[PDB]
Design a protein around this ligand. Sequence first.
Ligand SMILES: Nc1nc2c(ncn2[C@@H]2O[C@H](COP(=O)(O)OP(=O)(O)OP(=O)(O)O)[C@@H](O)[C@H]2O)c(=O)[nH]1
Ligand SMILES: Nc1nc2c(ncn2[C@@H]2O[C@H](COP(=O)(O)OP(=O)(O)O)[C@@H](O)[C@H]2O)c(=O)[nH]1
Ligand SMILES: [Mg+2]
Lengths: 49, 426, 97, 431, 277
Amino acid sequence: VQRKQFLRLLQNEQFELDMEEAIQKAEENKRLKELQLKQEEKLAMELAK
Amino acid sequence: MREIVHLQAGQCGNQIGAKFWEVISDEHGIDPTGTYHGDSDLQLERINVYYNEATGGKYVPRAVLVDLEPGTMDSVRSGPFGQIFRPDNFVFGQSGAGNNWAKGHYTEGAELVDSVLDVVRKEAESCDCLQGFQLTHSLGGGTGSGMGTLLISKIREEYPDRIMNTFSVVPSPKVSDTVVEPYNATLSVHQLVENTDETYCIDNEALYDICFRTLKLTTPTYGDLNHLVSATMSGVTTCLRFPGQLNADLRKLAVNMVPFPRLHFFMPGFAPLTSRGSQQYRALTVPELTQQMFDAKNMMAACDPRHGRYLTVAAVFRGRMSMKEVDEQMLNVQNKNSSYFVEWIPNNVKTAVCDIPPRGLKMSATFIGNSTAIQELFKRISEQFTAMFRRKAFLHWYTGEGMDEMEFTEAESNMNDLVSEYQQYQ
Amino acid sequence: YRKEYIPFPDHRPDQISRWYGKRKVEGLPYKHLITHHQEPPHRYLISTYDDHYNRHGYNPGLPPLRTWNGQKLLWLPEKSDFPLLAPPTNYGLYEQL
Amino acid sequence: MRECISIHVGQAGVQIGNACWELYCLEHGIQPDGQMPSDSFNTFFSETGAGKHVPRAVFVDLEPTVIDEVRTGTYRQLFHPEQLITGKEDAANNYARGHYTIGKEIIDLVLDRIRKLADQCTGLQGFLVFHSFGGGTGSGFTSLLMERLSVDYGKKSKLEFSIYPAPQVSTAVVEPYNSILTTHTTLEHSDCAFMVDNEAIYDICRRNLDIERPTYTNLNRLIGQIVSSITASLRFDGALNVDLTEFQTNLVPYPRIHFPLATYAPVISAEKAYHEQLSVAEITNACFEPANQMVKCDPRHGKYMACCLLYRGDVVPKDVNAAIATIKTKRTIQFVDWCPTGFKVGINYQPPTVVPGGDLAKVQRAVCMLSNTTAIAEAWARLDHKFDLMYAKRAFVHWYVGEGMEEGEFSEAREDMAALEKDYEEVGVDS
Amino acid sequence: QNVYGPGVRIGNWNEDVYLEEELMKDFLEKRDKGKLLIQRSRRLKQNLLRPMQLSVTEDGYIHYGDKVMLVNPDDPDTEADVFLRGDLSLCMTPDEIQSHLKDELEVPCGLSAVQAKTPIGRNTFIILSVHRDATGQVLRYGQDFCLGITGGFDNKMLYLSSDHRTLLKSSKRSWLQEVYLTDEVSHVNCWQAAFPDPQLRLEYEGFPVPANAKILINHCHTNRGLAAHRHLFLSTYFGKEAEVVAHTYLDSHRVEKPRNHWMLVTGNPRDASSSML
Ligand SMILES: Nc1nc2c(ncn2[C@@H]2O[C@H](COP(=O)(O)OP(=O)(O)OP(=O)(O)O)[C@@H](O)[C@H]2O)c(=O)[nH]1
Ligand SMILES: Nc1nc2c(ncn2[C@@H]2O[C@H](COP(=O)(O)OP(=O)(O)O)[C@@H](O)[C@H]2O)c(=O)[nH]1
Ligand SMILES: [Mg+2]
């Protein structure tokens, strides 16, 4: 019983950590894709000029 | 001051009793540690009804928690509110009944009842003025129906001048989780009729209807079903715990609901239930509560009250609130639905008002109803009982434990006499 | 038997799908089932006797005199539908205990 | 605390128990040395002060050539040196040889070992037996075993796992002789009797897993998956648990009716499982389909008498009820008149585990059906029709009558099987 | 039919969107206000696992006020089959459940033995005198001294304590006498250092104790040695730890067992963050 309560509390900790990584990954994807599009358009402008 | 003693049995009774003590601890501001952490002072004026004082300022429930299967004792203890429950208050056996009323009532549960009678007597005599007893169990299981009815017979002989309320889980009409479930429930209704003062019928499929249509949920599991019935449990003993304009306890409800000793099979309802999308867009007002209360979709039983006739109606209102609109709306529904009410009892409706609403909600109402439409619940299982008993099947698990054949015949005979007694007064 | 039954050292059983299942069957809490209008639990603890006799009907928000509503009929400022949500009823019981 | 004792008798029993105990080791995370890597396991393994875990089962056979591979295999350290009872010479496809002559000198040793195991056990759910009718040991010595367990322990549950002889393909000439005479022990000294045949599993593995040539190795894995799905309710925490007394109570309406059929779903490969979505309705109608029957008989001719469903994984009690309601409206599926609510549901949280290098896929949810139906009377009719055809000219009878038994056992056994068939039709007729 | 999930607009999706938005808003509000359980555990872990330095001796004698380390040496025992291997360190241990639910440490705290080598914020005891005002003194054999631990905290000081056996107070697993940490000052905080070999014990009584040497630690009021149980495991938020009790263990020759031997460990002069090991 004591070990089961300890496991339940640790699973709560794992749930909060999973929520934190899920709320970080989307912003990481957004910044990477925005940087990619900006670099692509700058290279296109310079080559055309 | 007027303490009530909670009692539970079976797997269903344990999973609903843990949820019952969660809302009371939230209502009285009791932390999962065991102390008190609240902001008002009316929560401590009547806290001895459910909670016993101890050292450390620790309030512990006045409940006994019994199951023949030790598997469910872990989940109650390892739940979010498991350390509040007293470790002495768990009584368990080594082997489960396994959906058999014969083992649960005559052989396996016959030795554990003497061990738990010491526990329930110790809790009863510790109260200065015991209000009564309250039980929640399930008729579809061996432990809840076999041994829970054994406690009903033993407590009734030991405390005759008391009041006993039961919250029994009736078998579901559409989907049945047990093949021998008509045997386990028919043999328990016969013991229920003559040894119980109030009986409420709760079915899981009508809980699913409320969670599908009224709540608009996609996964409302057994836990979310337990939240609805636990609010009804907390709402029916409201005036004992909190002061109000017009108080009515369990006995004051019983004296207005039971015109004959064979008519005590009720069907509950909880009024303020909405959806998450429509949460902010409807005003919580007395006409809105009384419109949702009397509808059949809100009701907590597998019986349509249109097919029958209402006999006597209860309503327990909570919150700071006014009495002209209560009396006007609840005379209006009696005036308009004259065909749905009996004419041999005038003023079929009883009104109770409290001051303190449930937490997070402005105003609440609990419906307790006696109706002759509850006889079609017994008609469905009786025709299932007969259709199985004609071929004498699944019987060697019942006659192999010392039960005679006549017990089934007297069980169907009293139960047919009960539905004939409901039909005459219709 | 010797070809197929090999030790498999790297395999460990899963221990998290069960615990996700426990919470998915445990279900939504009270705040997401029944709690209405996002009300904090400190405001609605108040009694009729304490509101009418102890506080003498003290509500600074409402004007002392009623005015006709206009668009809706009857008089707008009404005491009954507009109660007080002050700090709750308190006295020496908690301190004495 | 709650634990069951496994008896694996015969070559089929030993080879099934190998895969079953390997699956138990993989499920509880037990290395082949015998330890956990550097209390749900308590129902099968005993805790030593060294941390070593040993199983609470016995492997009995009359030949050493099947057990010596276990003694010299990968799992030599795990199994107890004494829990593997070996004989001297095999029964050699005979009933009287394994019943009256060879089974007598090892029954004392097996009884002593299981008495020590029952001394170990503080709470005992029952005995799960694994054997084959077509063998000599599994037909003869098993009869003595159940007849002795009935005297030794009174009301303990007896769950049975029999290798039924397939209707067309088979491996022995005198298999009807060895199959008629064991029904006497399995009729009153057994509580419930699950039946499997190898031809149906070949049929399953041909068109469901896309493997053309299977073996006993990847047949016993499916059998062990069934046994794991049965015992998972006792092993693991679930919403609705089923105990060994529970389904054994709910699946028999009469003492002479204790023969269900076992089915499993889904059974599908790793390539297919990524693209085929697996919902509860789609896994609960597949086990109702007759092509997924694991005994070679069609339940469309018969009537479903009782059912039991065991679910594993991320399953919610809603689409279970919705799919049961959907199933209840199918006119192809027929029920008896006296069993209107013929369903029983048990649910376990843990998803099924897969063996590396295996054929089955990683799956989130699974279900096994244990269904008692009337369609086994056709199988018994075929088997005793073959018995009557072979008995017509008195073939192979001297091998039985010279060993010590009386020739009247054949006639009384045929009469008992005829009476059992008659009782099956008397049960199956409606009121 | 078929189900799709969160983003796809089919079936009952509006209520799922409302519920997910409500849950995300509630989680964001809780983690903004700082009531996150992982944040509380992170604060507790950084409070308890903070490194520090250890005192460095010159002449090899233990001086008062030095920050020392209590280490049970390793011995090839044959009592059981599984037990902790290597030297163990005496570390404080709070209750796991109460530690998760409440931020503040509770008195009394339990103790344990952990496979820890570096001086961490859990197992560094300073040595004080009951007389106080002891500057540059020498701890001597058979003399009273007391042990204090800050436990990674700059607020309070706790002392080792033990008491006589009672039916309500016992050790967690071994059911023998128990040792805990309390802030109260009494005579139940008093310990003595003794020589292991019983023949030369009274001859070496009254001499300055060496550093990094095997000595016995005895309670003054109960006369029980500080024993480390290796064969009994304690589950803990920081893993699996050996047990610690107060009992005197004797062999057939009435010689103290390797369970009762304890070493005081100082800091390395070349690297203060490391010990003599
Ligand atoms: N499904 C399955 N069946 C098996 C397996 N091993 C053996 N069998 C069955 O066993 C039957 C042959 O009889 P056995 O059980 O091997 O014979 P026995 O019990 O050792 O008795 P004796 O032959 O006298 O030694 C075959 O028809 C198979 O159906 C197996 O690994 N899986
Ligand atoms: N409403 C509700 N019903 C439940 C819950 N748990 C189980 N049940 C019902 O209880 C029935 C099984 O009862 P059972 O366990 O056999 O009773 P016992 O043998 O006395 O423990 C099932 O059909 C479920 O539908 C719950 O938490 N809430
Ligand atoms: Mg053999």
